């Protein structure tokens, strides 16, 4: 049970950071532009079984676009990303959508306004209406704070499996096992590397 998901949107909107968060739990502070596309499998456990997304995280920078719409071929769902602190990224949403639906004529698509954690919001909530006529789902999200981060994948899962009452569930937890000079050096380096974002609530 696997589905091809294409992720599209302007450079710097947080596509790769969003995916990485889902993959490993981490939050990547640096902006390393995606080159063409990166494909990652991403599994969720649900009350209807596991669902596997093969996430095609595409490049938003025109100069790094690679195959561009060639990535969309046979996609079964999609996320269109923009950044609520950058109005141009919202203005470009119809362009991304155009290119996407020309290749993928009838797929479920989530529109996501990323970076809502940032105080100075520029794309006003009230302005976000493009999704309505296009039947896209919309969510405010933040890859940084995790605000609504699961929502796009839950909705897509529901649409793809065709079960509106589908929910994420806890993986059963197998009992863990009962298992040196370099350990000392490794731990020392760890202890003396500051933890990030020490001003956060957790």
């Amino acid at each position: 049970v696997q589905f091809k998901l294409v992720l599209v949107g302007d450079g710097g909107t947080g596509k790769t950071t969003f995916v990485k968060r889902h993959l490993t739990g981490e939050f990547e502070k640096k902006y390393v532009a995606t080159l063409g596309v990166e494909v990652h499998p991403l599994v969720f456990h649900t009350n209807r079984g596991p669902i596997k997304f093969n996430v095609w995280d595409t490049a938003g920078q025109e100069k790094f676009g690679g195959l561009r719409d060639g990535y969309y071929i046979q996609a079964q769902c999609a996320i269109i990303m923009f950044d609520v602190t950058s109005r141009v990224t919202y203005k470009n949403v119809p362009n991304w959508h155009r290119d996407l639906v020309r290749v993928c004529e009838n797929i479920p698509i989530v529109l996501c306004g990323n970076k809502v954690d940032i105080k100075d919001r520029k794309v006003k909530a009230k302005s976000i209406v493009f999704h309505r006529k296009k039947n896209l789902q919309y969510y405010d999200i933040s890859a940084k704070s995790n605000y609504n981060f699961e929502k796009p994948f839950l909705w897509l899962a529901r649409k793809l499996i065709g079960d509106p009452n589908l929910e994420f569930v806890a993986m059963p937890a197998l009992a863990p096992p009962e298992v040196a000079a370099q350990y000392e050096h490794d731990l020392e380096v760890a202890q003396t590397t500051a933890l990030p974002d020490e001003d956060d609530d957790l």
Binding site: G25, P176, V189, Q191, A194, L195, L202
Partner: protein, 121 residues
């Protein structure tokens, strides 16, 4: 987790040290539970991410482990884990775990050490 008693639960953020890059990377935020197996009396750490409920920590609170402070925090502990199976096959990590307050951090350590004594029996 039906065969297990919840000895302790606390909200936490878990990191793993990437040694290649010299940085801490978040692995999950959510409830960190200490779980005692009712059949075997072994105590493990089991932690799950909020919302996705994916396991980000699953390992025995081995008696050999030692909680160490991080240089940047008065509300975190770092320790070497030799066998965590959150991702699948048993794997070694240097973990850091941070809490909402110093009080919570100190309570964790106390509970952590009690669980170590249980695991010793």
């Amino acid at each position: 987790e039906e065969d297990e008693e919840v000895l302790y639960k606390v909200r936490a953020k878990l990191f793993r040290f990437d040694k290649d890059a010299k940085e801490w990377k978040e692995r999950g935020t959510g409830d960190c539970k200490f779980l005692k197996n009712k059949k075997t009396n072994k105590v493990r750490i089991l932690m799950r991410r909020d919302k996705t409920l994916k396991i980000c920590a699953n390992h025995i609170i081995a008696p050999e482990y030692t909680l160490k402070p991080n240089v940047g925090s008065d509300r975190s502990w770092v320790y070497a884990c030799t066998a965590d199976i959150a991702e699948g096959e048993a794997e070694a990590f240097t973990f850091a775990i941070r809490f909402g307050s110093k009080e919570n951090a100190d309570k964790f350590k106390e509970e952590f050490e009690k669980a170590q004594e249980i695991n010793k029996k």
